[PDB]
């Protein structure tokens, strides 16, 4: 990868970084009981529970309708419905344990239920508010009476209902195809995530990535309408390095020619893996210290001209007519600081001068040595390490791959081309 | 700017306003405190909430090291000195006698946001002595602080990138402390100005430069611009309509806002820029700079304008230009039920123009009112227009016409 | 619309399902009254019962400047609505005068011309439940405690949503939602269809009593007929070992007897219905719809970039897919079923597949979607378009080099 020669046509390629993928499907299950239990209601708070119950129908019924729709030609329609329903049938095998064990929650008040068949595979539950109801109990008994504890309960349940309706956001009746994230249900309780999301089974890797499952989504496989429970297929990853995998980043800072601030367009991220060469879509997936955690293999294919630009045949790099963003004008390359020195007047005060650039040379590097005090607006700064020249500086450069990016401009151009075709050999 | 023709071809120029920019970077540092007061030891639920608040700050403590990071680090390192300075005063002012008290010299302030709900707590206090319970006061206090926690968390739950960018913004912190700060937002900083722009402090962004896990406080460098006009730079703001042709309905697209200056202009983007009674406020001059062809379309050889196919909506019935009416009545048929007729069908036309003097009350699809109607507008001019800028937008359609041209040119270049 | 001839190029089409839209609107005016009047007692009152009032009402009432602009035309739809509200404002104020000091009658059903302004008072049901604490059980000072904190809570819930969505102002009045939202207009149609719908707006406001005035629309559902909504789901198919797909919208429909796209992003699915006021009929290229009409040999294409499972899916039990990115293993007997290079897919049917187990997932057959017949066609790869405009720019710039060097 020609990392260096690009840095006279406006690029920062940061560094290689590794990669990981969630190869397998390590899977435990969760279930919920959305009601809190009281030990004694001697005519205590039950209206608020009825209000919450009545409210929850709106959220819970579309879920049951969709879950009912999930079934294919049954073995007792769309793409991911296939894999979802197959996973539901594979959950039918543990339906036995689930349906045996659902009752122990209603039977007994408790915050988290840890009943499990085996040590490794365990299925657990959480009453929606019981962690706080164990201290809502005391205003009701032996601190105060219930007339206002019921009110406290009402406000608590309303906050919780909005806090669930945000993430199960009923934008559509058939919403179930959209993924509920692990983090809304993480926030379902406030201060039990660092316990259960690390303890649910053997989860060894540190807080940084494996305990940082942003992208992960969650199914729904059992919803009930009489005890008002939810069940969730909680996937879980298991990660290792992937081979020869080098993920770079890509910026594009302008080189202005004849007062035309243009820039090569490129993706956010570019990677390389032996012969593979493509700009992944990694917005969904995490930036780690030295290796990107993405479940899939996001590498794909691009225009041949872009690879030729990266491979080194830079005379095919496409220029682009723009009013650039605020970004592409100047930043630092690991000691070698680059700008566009025709617009911003890079001005070394040591030695004191405006810094000379010809219109021919797009931009020009000034390193640790040629000027310790590389001068721009706010320079009281540090200057240590290498940014290498290494481009046969100066050189002749071509332009013949310029482009326009907005469609209407292309429509204009091709309409001209139509008239020209109708004019050429008519 | 041949508005007398733009009225006749469909394009409109409504509400020309001014422009101003606060290109300056006046900053003052105003921070947080999250642990309010109590008398002889209440602590009735104050321990149930602070480990919880640490559970928030969990994903706020870390840090690590681009033409915006240079800013986000140069400001920070030039002010790391002032941060070290305010460390001492922070230590001094963590404990207080009142909610809202902090003092520094060097006229620039260091006045903190404040112990968050300590206003309402100073209201709450006088019940809790002589009228109420530790139990009831802690009840009130717990429900209040939990409200405040959720109201806080919605602004900023977390670090990880792109939350702080559309997170911590000063107006969202103002929304957080809204009940407290409605009166004194302007006064917290020394600068004073009219309601709209600087007193409003347009949707600015601020970055947390230091955080104290140990004492539950965040160090915020509040940015705070200084405004000044930009003269010989006005706006001729824009909105388009439908326009019939050959009994078919086409249109012409344009931006939502533009700007002119003396001899230059542009369709300036103003999403991050709030509109006002006479002059809107961009933080920096936009550069939505455009074709010579569309420049001519605007302010010259208007026959060089484009023309495109509506599909979504019937944009007419907002056909009101200086009291008059400008709409696509060749197809969206109209009526002057006084001065009675049905409005006619000039087939070359896409928009009639009907004056207040012509029709003393115009009908549309079936309603009848009148605006003023005595304004200022005129028209008598039929026109026939060149057709050499037909375009589209749908990339499929562009590609298909390109492949058609490929077929044609391949025939030709074999021939 | 021609599902049959489209099955052979990856198409799915879920079902015909009509539309049910809003055409009769039945505008209603609602006033919000505040400060729940204590039942006719004395000896209790506070200030933060009132503090928020100036606060919110002063945020709101200066929003009047942007109303006189009567001198996308929802501006004037709004204008006409406000004119009708102006016309009724007389009786609005008369009612408000009647109800204010009446300090009971939480909901009003006068019905002078149309249904009355209900004048939903904030809390008075709970306050009626509350009074018996405040009298014959305790003083009104424990009542002041409870009422202060509850009223503050109700205010905090107001401030969330004050372009309002009507379900939130419903959620203010948790019990009172379904009653009025059901029975204002006599709802003999499905209440649930009505529940889906959501706009609600303020027209003006009082500041001395601090009452908010709203102009609610609450329409009827008239089924349009001879028009059915379709869902669309395309998948891959292969050419020369190049996996290309067919771009199409999320939905299409057949208005009357003509065709066109469909935008039910606005609205909610049903079993035969799609509750959107607007009638999306967005015309698309005649070239495109030539295929949907049946002339398949002039369809567009595109290079694929997606996940895997859009490369296989069901059609009425019998599965359809590319047999190359997912090696078709019918258990008749379980073995790989490769294609001719001519084709891209194979419509595999009730031949021997009793219960297929491709990709490890064992499940059952008995296809019913008929036409167990493949597709021979022209080499019909004509419209090899590209989606992202960049590739088109470089393509035409190569074309520009070509024409410029060849024109000499």
């Amino acid at each position, epitope marked *: 990868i020609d990392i260096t020669k690009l840095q006279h046509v406006g690029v920062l390629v940061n560094s290689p970084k590794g990669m990981k993928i969630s190869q397998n499907f390590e899977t435990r299950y969760l279930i919920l009981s959305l009601i809190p239990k009281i030990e004694d209601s*001697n*005519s205590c708070g039950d209206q608020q529970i009825k209000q919450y119950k009545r409210l929850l129908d709106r959220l819970i019924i579309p879920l049951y309708d969709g879950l009912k729709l999930q079934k294919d030609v049954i073995v007792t329609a769309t793409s991911a419905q296939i894999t979802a329903a197959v996973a539901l049938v594979e959950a039918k095998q543990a339906k036995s344990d689930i349906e045996k064990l659902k009752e122990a929650i209603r039977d007994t008040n408790k915050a988290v239920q840890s009943v499990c068949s085996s040590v490794g595979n365990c299925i657990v539950a959480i009453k929606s508010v019981q962690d706080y109801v164990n201290k809502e109990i005391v205003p009701s*008994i*032996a*601190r*105060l*009476g219930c007339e206002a504890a019921g009110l406290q309960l009402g406000i608590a349940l309303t906050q919780h209902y909005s806090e669930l309706t945000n993430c199960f956001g009923d934008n559509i009746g058939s919403l179930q195809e959209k993924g509920i994230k692990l983090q809304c249900i993480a926030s379902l309780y406030r201060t039990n995530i660092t316990e259960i999301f690390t303890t649910s089974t053997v989860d060894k890797y540190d807080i940084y990535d494996l305990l940082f499952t942003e992208s992960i989504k969650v199914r729904v496989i059992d919803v009930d309408l009489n005890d008002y429970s939810i069940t969730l297929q909680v996937r879980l990853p298991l990660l290792t390095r992937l081979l020869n995998t080098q993920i770079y980043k890509v910026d594009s800072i302008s080189y202005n020619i004849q007062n035309r601030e243009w820039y090569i367009p490129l993706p956010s991220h570019i990677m390389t893996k032996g012969a593979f060469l493509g700009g992944a879509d990694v917005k969904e997936c995490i930036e780690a210290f030295s290796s990107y955690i993405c479940p899939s293999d996001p590498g794909f294919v691009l225009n041949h001209e872009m690879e030729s630009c990266l491979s080194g045949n830079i005379s095919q790099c496409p220029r682009t007519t723009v009013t650039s963003d605020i970004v592409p004008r100047y930043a630092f390359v690991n000691g070698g600081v680059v700008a566009n020195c025709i617009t911003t007047t890079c001005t070394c005060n040591g030695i004191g001068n405006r810094i000379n650039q010809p219109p021919d040379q797009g931009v020009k590097i000034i390193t640790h040595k040629e000027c310790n005090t590389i001068g721009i607006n706010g320079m009281l700064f540090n200057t240590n390490k290498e940014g290498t020249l290494a481009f046969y500086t100066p050189d002749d450069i071509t332009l013949n791959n310029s482009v326009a990016l907005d469609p209407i401009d292309i429509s204009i151009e091709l309409n001209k081309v139509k008239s020209d075709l109708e004019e050429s050999k008519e | 700017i041949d508005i007398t023709k733009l009225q006749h071809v469909g394009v409109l120029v409504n509400s020309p306003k001014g422009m101003k920019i606060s290109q300056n970077f006046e900053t003052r540092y105003l921070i947080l405190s999250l642990i309010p007061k109590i008398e*002889d*030891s*209440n602590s009735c639920g104050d321990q149930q909430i602070k480990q919880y608040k640490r559970l928030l700050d969990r994903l706020i403590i870390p840090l690590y090291d681009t033409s915006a990071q240079i800013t986000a680090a140069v400001a920070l390192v030039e002010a790391k000195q002032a941060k070290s300075d305010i460390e001492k005063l922070k230590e001094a002012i963590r404990d207080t006698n009142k909610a809202v008290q902090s003092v520094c010299s060097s006229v620039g302030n260091c006045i903190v946001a404040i112990k968050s709900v300590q206003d309402y707590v100073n209201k709450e206090i006088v*019940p*809790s*002595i*002589a*009228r*109420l*319970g*530790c*139990e*009831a006061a802690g009840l009130q206090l717990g429900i209040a602080l939990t409200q405040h926690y959720s109201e806080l968390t919605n602004c900023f739950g977390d670090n990880i990138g792109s939350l702080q960018e559309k997170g911590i913004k000063l107006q969202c912190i103002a929304s957080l402390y809204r009940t407290n700060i409605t009166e004194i937002f302007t006064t917290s900083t020394v600068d004073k100005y009219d309601i709209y722009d600087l007193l409003f402090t347009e949707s600015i962004k601020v970055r947390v430069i230091d955080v104290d896990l140990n004492d539950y406080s965040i160090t915020l460098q509040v940015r705070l611009p200084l405004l000044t006009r930009l003269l010989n730079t006005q706006i001729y703001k824009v909105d388009s309509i439908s326009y019939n042709i050959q009994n078919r309905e086409w249109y012409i697209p344009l931006p939502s806002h533009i700007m002119t200056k003396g001899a230059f202009l542009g369709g300036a983007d103003v999403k991050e820029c709030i509109e006002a009674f006479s002059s809107y406020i961009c933080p920096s001059d936009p550069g939505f700079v455009l074709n010579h062809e569309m420049e001519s379309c605007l302010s010259g050889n208007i026959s060089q304008c484009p023309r495109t196919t509506v599909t979504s909506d019937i944009v007419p019935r907002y056909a009101f230009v200086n009291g008059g009416v400008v709409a696509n009545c060749i197809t969206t048929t109209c009526t002057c039920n006084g001065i009675g007729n049905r409005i006619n069908q000039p087939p070359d036309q896409g928009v009639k123009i009907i004056t207040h003097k012509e029709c003393n009350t115009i009908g549309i699809n079936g309603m009848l009112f009148n605006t003023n109607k005595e304004g200022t507008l005129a028209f008598y001019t039929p026109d026939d227009i060149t057709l050499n800028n037909s375009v589209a937008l749908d990339p499929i359609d562009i590609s298909i016409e390109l492949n058609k041209v490929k077929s044609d040119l391949e025939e030709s270049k074999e021939w | 619309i021609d599902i049959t001839k489209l099955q052979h190029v990856g198409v799915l089409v879920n079902s015909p399902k009509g539309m049910k839209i809003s055409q009769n609107f039945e505008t209603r005016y609602l006033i919000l009254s505040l400060i729940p009047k204590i039942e006719d007692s004395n000896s209790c009152g506070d200030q933060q019962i009132k503090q928020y009032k100036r606060l919110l009402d002063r945020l709101i009432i200066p929003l009047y400047d942007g109303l006189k602009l009567q001198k996308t035309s929802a501006q004037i739809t709004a204008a006409v609505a406000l004119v009708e509200a102006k016309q009724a404002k007389s009786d609005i104020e008369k009612l408000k005068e009647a109800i204010r000091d009446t300090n009971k009658a939480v909901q009003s059903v006068c019905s002078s011309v149309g249904n009355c302004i209900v004048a939903i008072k904030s809390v008075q049901d709970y306050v009626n439940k509350e009074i018996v604490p405040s009298i*014959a*059980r*305790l*003083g009104c*000072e*424990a009542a002041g*405690l409870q009422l202060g904190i509850a009223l503050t809570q109700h205010y905090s819930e107001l401030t969330n949503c004050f372009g309002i969505k009507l379900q939130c102002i419903a959620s203010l009045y948790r019990t009172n939602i379904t009653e009025i939202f059901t029975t204002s207009t006599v709802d003999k149609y499905d209440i649930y269809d009505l529940l889906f719908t959501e706009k609600v707006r303020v027209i003006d406001v009082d500041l001395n009593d601090y009452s908010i005035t709203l102009q609610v629309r609450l329409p009827l559902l008239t089924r349009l007929l001879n028009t059915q909504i379709y869902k669309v789901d395309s998948i891959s198919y292969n050419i020369q070992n190049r996996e290309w797909y067919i771009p199409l919208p999320s939905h299409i429909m057949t208005k009357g007897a003509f065709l066109g796209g469909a935008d039910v992003k606005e609205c909610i699915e049903a079993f035969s219905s799609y509750i959107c006021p607007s009638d999306p009929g967005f015309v698309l290229n005649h070239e495109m719809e030539s295929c949907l009409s049946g002339n398949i040999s002039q369809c567009p294409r595109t290079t694929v970039t997606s996940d895997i499972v859009p490369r296989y899916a069901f059609v009425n039990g019998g599965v359809v897919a590319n047999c190359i990115t997912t090696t078709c293993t019918c258990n008749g007997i379980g073995n790989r079923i490769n294609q001719p290079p001519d084709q891209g897919v194979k419509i595999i049917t009730h031949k021997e597949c009793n219960t297929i187990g491709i990709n490890g997932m064992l499940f059952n057959t008995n296809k019913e979607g008929t036409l167990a017949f493949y597709t021979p066609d022209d080499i019909t790869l004509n419209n090899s378009v590209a989606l992202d405009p960049i590739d088109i720019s470089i393509e035409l710039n190569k074309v520009k080099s070509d024409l410029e060097e060849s024109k000499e």
Partner: antibody, heavy 120, light 106 residues
Framework: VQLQESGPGLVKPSETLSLTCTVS????????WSWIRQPPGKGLEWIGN???????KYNPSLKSRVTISVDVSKNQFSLNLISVTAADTAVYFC???????????????WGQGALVTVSS | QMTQSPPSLSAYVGDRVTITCRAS??????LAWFQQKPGKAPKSLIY???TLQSGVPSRFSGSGSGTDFTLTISSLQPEDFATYYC?????????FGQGTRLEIKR
């Protein structure tokens, strides 16, 4: 007004106990009553209240042990508990008190003494 | 929770005599001083710290609020020879104190 107790004064351990208390005057059903006890030596321990609508509220120091009764016609009310140990050798007064503000307080109003002497 | 400053006071007739009950937790809402007299039936005396009951003389009065509270008496007589207590209402279990065995003299 006047309250007045009634019932036996001897109970063998881990048995049931129940004693009655009745007014002589006043007006029932308009407010509460309550029960207070103390050992003969030291202290004073609240047991629980009785409310005329059949509602009771108890000190969780004696949680899930006890029940208090209502009697609107005979104008009385009584106790019924099951874990009658020996360490509860005590006296069992009666309460009749009235509103004040925040929530309402029971105390000694009339009771001469419920002479309890449990034994083995 | 409550307590008692003296467990007894060997106070002879003809002096001011008082008390300092301190609330734990220190808090406002109020305490019903009542006298228990062994040998007869008790009764409640000072509801809400100065509103002494019907018919009790004005000799007793209560002065204070919050963290603690105190008495005010003069013109003593022997018939007030009975163990008093104090109280904490607004922590629902209806607390009391150890006791004040007054002892008149002479």
């Amino acid at each position: 007004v006047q309250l007045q107790e009634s019932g036996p004064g001897l109970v063998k351990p881990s048995e049931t106990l129940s004693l009655t208390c009745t007014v002589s005057g006043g007006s029932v059903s308009s407010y509460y009553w309550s029960w207070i006890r103390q050992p003969p030596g030291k202290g004073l321990e609240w047991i629980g209240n009785i409310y005329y609508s059949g509602t009771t509220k108890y000190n969780p120091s004696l949680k899930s042990r006890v029940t208090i009764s209502v009697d609107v016609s005979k104008n009385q009310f009584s106790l019924n508990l099951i874990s009658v140990t020996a360490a509860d050798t005590a006296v069992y007064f009666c309460a009749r008190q009235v509103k004040s503000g925040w929530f309402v307080q029971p105390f000694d109003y009339w009771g001469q003494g419920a002479l309890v002497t449990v034994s083995s | 929770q409550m307590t008692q400053s003296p467990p007894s006071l060997s106070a002879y007739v003809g002096d001011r005599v008082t008390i300092t009950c301190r609330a734990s937790q220190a808090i406002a809402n109020y305490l019903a001083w009542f006298q228990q007299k062994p040998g007869k039936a008790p009764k409640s005396l000072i509801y809400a710290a100065s509103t002494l009951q019907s018919g009790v003389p004005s000799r007793f009065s209560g002065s204070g609020s919050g963290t603690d509270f105190t008495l005010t008496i003069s013109s003593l007589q022997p018939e007030d020879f009975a163990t008093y207590y104090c109280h904490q209402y607004n922590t629902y279990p209806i607390t009391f104190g150890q006791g004040t065995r007054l002892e008149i003299k002479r």
